[PDB]
């Protein structure tokens, strides 16, 4: 509908595939060569679903901060025959806030779908399912189950992706370019 829709749209329509793991269908971002993201707790295994092709997962690796905290993002290897476009250059350097941001999500159960959240806080620390979590974006919507690994945008940059709620907000984890160096 305007530019921050834009900016949502082409990353979903060259940067997403459909994951799913034992736990279920998620939105799974990829972000360069053969490397993508997805919450942890869709508990990634040896074998995952990508569009409903059986995939090996070459590598996985849960992130915590250097404190040994949770951060609730899985950084995965594919063992896929096509690279994604690398979109290393739209992820934030720092921790922040943000103005009008859109999730965005696309699975069986909610096909191109795009939700103006609004103002996302910094909030930084999260019980999250009964783990402590670092690194939290929240913003004013209430989120269900089937957005978890939802991309985080504004415009010119992919700054989360969509891990839970409360029934009134919902929680985001911060990509970082820091994360993705090679
Ligand atoms: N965003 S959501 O997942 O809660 C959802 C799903 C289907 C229809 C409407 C809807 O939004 C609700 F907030 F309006």
């Known amino acids: 509908m305007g530019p921050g829709f834009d900016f949502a749209q082409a ?3 060259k940067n997403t595939v459909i ?3 034992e736990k279920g269908e ?8 053969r490397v993508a993201v997805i919450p942890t707790h869709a508990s990634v295994g ?3 679903y990508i569009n409903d092709v059986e ?4 590598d996985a690796c849960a992130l915590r901060d250097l404190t040994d905290t949770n951060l609730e993002i899985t950084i995965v290897k594919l063992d896929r025959n096509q690279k994604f476009r690398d979109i290393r ?9 943000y103005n009008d941001a859109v999730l965005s999500v696309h699975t069986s159960k909610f096909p191109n779908m795009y939700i103006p959240v609004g103002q996302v806080t910094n909030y930084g620390f999260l019980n999250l399912g009964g783990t402590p979590t670092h690194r939290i974006l929240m913003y004013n919507f209430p989120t269900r189950a ?8 504004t ?13 009134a907000q919902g929680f985001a984890a911060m990509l970082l370019h820091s994360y993705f160096t090679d």
């Open 55 to 58: 995939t090996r997962v070459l």
């Open 11 to 13: 990353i979903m329509k």
């Open 89 to 97: 250059h739209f992820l934030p350097r720092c921790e922040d806030d």
């Open 26 to 33: 998620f939105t799974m971002l990829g972000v360069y060569d």
């Open 46 to 48: 040896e074998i995952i």
């Open 155 to 167: 415009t010119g940059k992919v700054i989360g992706i969509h891990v839970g709620g409360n029934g």
């Open 146 to 153: 089937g957005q978890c690994g939802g991309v985080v945008t």
């Open 19 to 21: 994951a799913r793991t």
